[PDB]
């Protein structure tokens, strides 16, 4: 941790204290991927397949219209970040399929 300057204003303002390093709380482990969860999600993915909008984004990415795929993903999902992550994982799916073939 960075030491505070001891002033009321500016950068690193605040009263000077000896900051501690603390063990990470297990409530903050959420979002970390587990081995069993990865295995179950991969198996369920190959069992179930894809959604129709996912297939639409897949064929758009195959055609190479990245901006159109991003816009369609944003329209389908709602937020730009979710659209970007969906496009990333579908591009990963395309890359895995093409490295298999």
């Amino acid at each position: 941790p960075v030491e505070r300057t001891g002033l009321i204003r500016g950068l690193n303002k605040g009263h000077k204290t000896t900051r501690r390093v603390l063990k990470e709380r297990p409530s903050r482990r959420k979002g970390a991927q587990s081995k069993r969860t990865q295995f179950v999600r991969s198996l369920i993915r190959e069992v179930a397949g894809l959604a129709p909008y996912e297939r639409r984004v897949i064929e758009l990415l195959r055609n190479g219209k990245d901006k159109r795929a991003r816009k369609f993903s944003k329209k389908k999902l709602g937020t730009f970040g979710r659209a970007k992550r969906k496009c990333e994982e579908l591009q990963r799916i395309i890359a895995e399929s093409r490295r298999a073939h």
């Binding site: 069993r36 295995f39 198996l43 369920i44 190959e46 069992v47």
Partner: protein, 105 residues
Amino acid sequence: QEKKERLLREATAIKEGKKKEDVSKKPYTVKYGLNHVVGLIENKKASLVLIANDVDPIELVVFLPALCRKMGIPYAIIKGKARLGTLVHKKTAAVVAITEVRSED
């Protein structure tokens, strides 16, 4: 009943000062129960899996052939959850599995 005489014999053994393993042998039974069989398949302990063809809801066993194919487990779909229940002393069994059998089998 057989569990009752087994526990009585183990009680006599622990009364006269012997462990239950000294008088009881390692059992070999058909493994059943959906969560138990899924865990055995995931841990690659099951040697053979039999899945009933008429499980309602079907989502309980719809992933089991794919799981067995991924984990390299010999699986077979058979007719009769009641037929498996007659094996496992129940009315209904969705899936049964063999992990180990005896040296005679």
